[PDB]
Symmetry: C3
Subunit: 229 residues, 3 copies
Amino acid sequence: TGRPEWIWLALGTALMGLGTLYFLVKGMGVSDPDAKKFYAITTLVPAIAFTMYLSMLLGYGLTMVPFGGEQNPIYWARYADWLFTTPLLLLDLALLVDADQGTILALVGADGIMIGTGLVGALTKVYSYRFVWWAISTAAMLYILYVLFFGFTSKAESMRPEVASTFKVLRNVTVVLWSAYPVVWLIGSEGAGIVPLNIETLLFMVLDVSAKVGFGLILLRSRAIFGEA
Amino acid sequence: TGRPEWIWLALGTALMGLGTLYFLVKGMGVSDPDAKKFYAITTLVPAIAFTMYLSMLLGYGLTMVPFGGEQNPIYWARYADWLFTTPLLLLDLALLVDADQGTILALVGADGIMIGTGLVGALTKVYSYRFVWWAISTAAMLYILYVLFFGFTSKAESMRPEVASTFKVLRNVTVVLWSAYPVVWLIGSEGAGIVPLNIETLLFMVLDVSAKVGFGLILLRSRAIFGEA
Amino acid sequence: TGRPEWIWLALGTALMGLGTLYFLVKGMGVSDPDAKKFYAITTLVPAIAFTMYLSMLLGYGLTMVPFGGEQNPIYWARYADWLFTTPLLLLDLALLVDADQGTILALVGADGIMIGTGLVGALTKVYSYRFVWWAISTAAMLYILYVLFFGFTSKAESMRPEVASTFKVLRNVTVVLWSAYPVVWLIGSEGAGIVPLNIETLLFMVLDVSAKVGFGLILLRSRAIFGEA
Ligand SMILES: *C/C=C(C)/C=C/C=C(C)/C=C/C1=C(C)CCCC1(C)C
Ligand SMILES: *C/C=C(C)/C=C/C=C(C)/C=C/C1=C(C)CCCC1(C)C
Ligand SMILES: *C/C=C(C)/C=C/C=C(C)/C=C/C1=C(C)CCCC1(C)C
């Protein structure tokens, strides 16, 4: 194809697909209902990302949004991916540390606003307002990172050290990889246009694989997922 | 801006935003998992309404729908608000009186049809059919009001009198404020066009703040939310 | 109306509506919370299908999708129906055999991809790619049929014989009726265009009523829904 960013969309599609199959093959056999949950959730993440990467690759997940007096290529399928994948990732973390339903409700609701305010920001036709929507989404992200640090973390330690330690690593990964997303949006095609879409697509591809597949490897190789007791 | 209804969209945006912050500040500290749930649910309601009011205010949540041979301004973002907020409000009520999963399923499903049939009605291009969709949505609303009165109410009394009494007030508020919505739609911009959008926007703004913020004040100041036992 | 397929859309609308009322009237009185769940779920199925059939009948749920250098009539409202009804049908089956949350999560997620990949396939503008999306959706369907056969079936027998036997019948019905859907899509208006939309609409109408109403009659007349113990 003629879009310069095809190679990264193709790469991203292959790695999500490859990682979906691996978690599928590893998953079969497992009879533990606790482990059964983590495998379901964590395998669905790249299975979804795979379909959205494919839709971007084939060109379905792309509309042109006019702003700054020019048609801009906006991959809307990213947000449809994130709207479903980011909540499932948070659910993986909350089941580990055995969060109560209240905390889960807030995280998931806040996540919904983050991605939703992101999408509206991405399709807003007044340039200034795009940044208003980014700020609100970013404000929701910080709330989520606050809950991951101060809503549970002390209660995550008052339990199995395999759950506590495995949570500590996955939390640190989540914070570092998720924080990058707003910065890339801000300087990429959707915000200031400082970085061209080509390289922005590379950056999201690296972030998405690490945040989904990299994340899943750490979790599915740990012994926190099993109950044993 | 040049839209006459801006002042009410701006007002509504400020009050939802102001009410979101208040429930947030009041919320922090609370350690009771039952209370934790009611706070999560009831704070998310205006947080969502805030973003949709903002989108209306900035002009994103507005399309023109042609019917009666004229372009009509239709704020579609109301329905995206209600689709999420109205179920969470019903969930607040069902957790109080400890409804079973079956009853919750019906209420939420019925709510989905109500708002969905509402949206389709709002974007239908044949004037007569709009009223067909209104009737079906209104038929779903009555079903919901029947369940609130006769599916639980006797079982809501066979429990803590703080839960029973606090439910009685919130139920009466819900019935009176929710019943108005179909009437306003019917006579406003979306139906008969007897009341102009300007004043219709005022009416929904007053209804929405009372049904969301007013509602939340009553609930969050009560001692039904806490378990204690 | 001038659309040849109106008679089947009208028929389908009447039978869904008629079946919704019947399950409603039969439903009232029932006080058993287990039975309460199955009635909620199984009554919502045709209540939803009714509204989507109506939207198709009135002409709201229809867009023209250009491919093969011609505008093609595509009833998008089928997918909005299935996106909600097919998960609720699977939930009826999983509550019978008392599946764990993990298995339910996978089935529902897989179902989401099936219908989602179906919709994208239905609105893809490159003819070849439509079949790529069909293959992925069909691959998700087979996964679901595998879980219905080999993820539970042995555990469905290790319990009440009324639950085991009633599950056996409903499973066999599900497999036979669901497998037809991809074949009809493939040869109908959305795929190869071997069968005209007129007769395709007939075929989906017969499948939908049997898969929803026929299905519901078998389930709601059984004694598996009640707990008794
Ligand atoms: C699987 C992909 C993941 C984990 C994606 C995460 C994406 C975010 C955390 C995005 C955040 C954004 C903001 C907070 C600012 C507005 C723009 C967004 C949506 C990129
Ligand atoms: C937070 C806002 C609330 C509580 C909104 C409630 C809205 C309704 C109960 C709307 C009902 C409608 C009908 C039953 C008739 C069709 C038009 C609607 C959607 C306004
Ligand atoms: C109430 C209606 C029901 C049970 C509909 C079921 C529909 C399917 C199982 C559709 C399956 C499809 C594929 C697996 C291939 C792609 C096209 C679809 C969506 C028709």
